[PDB]
Amino acid sequence: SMADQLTEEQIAEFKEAFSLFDKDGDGTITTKQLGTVMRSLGQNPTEAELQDMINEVDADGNGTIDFPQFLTMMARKMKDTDSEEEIREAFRVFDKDGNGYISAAELRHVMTNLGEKLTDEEVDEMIREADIDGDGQVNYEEFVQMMTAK
């Protein structure tokens, strides 16, 4: 299996189950629907297990699950690394929506707090400078690379 790598083929594998109930495909389901999605994830685990999943995601208590919170739970099961935290938190400070990518606005928030003003041209070119694959956006492994290598 390649689920641990969370390849595009695999992200689609569980997204399909999530979107089965979310007809609009917006990426939002309620915890009432998550129990039904849990049936699509496996062979009907005991209610305590089913409940444990809805309980952790509904930490907020709003009854509704946004898609990156669904991903946060799975990513943690696949990664299992406690020392990665020095870098992960740094990414989360600016990644408030949790979409896993860096936009120019996210860097603007951080640099402003220092009381310094990076030019908008520098912030926009930083994304292309960091990115090595031409997609116009930077993900977590690309962000780690920035400091751990030249």
């Binding site: 740094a90 220092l114 070119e125 400078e129 400091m147």
Partner: protein, 73 residues
């Protein structure tokens, strides 16, 4: 007497095609107006990513030039 042929093709199309659900919208946007592309160099300093990680690490940084300029309350 003189005469000329007459044609003028001008159709319009209303037959729908290419349908799909197409259901999407976005909650937030930035739309900066400060952004422009006058630079030819298009260079950017690694400081932009460095400053982010130094401040969340809590690494000590110090600057003097940031004092002169527009004030703040």
């Amino acid at each position: 007497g003189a005469d000329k042929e007459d044609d003028q093709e001008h159709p319009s199309e209303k037959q729908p095609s290419g349908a799909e659900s197409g259901t999407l919208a976005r909650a937030s946007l930035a739309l900066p107006t400060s952004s422009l592309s006058r630079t030819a160099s298009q260079s950017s300093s690694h400081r932009g990513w460095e400053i982010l990680r130094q401040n969340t690490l809590g690494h000590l940084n110090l600057g003097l030039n940031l004092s002169e300029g527009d004030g703040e309350e």
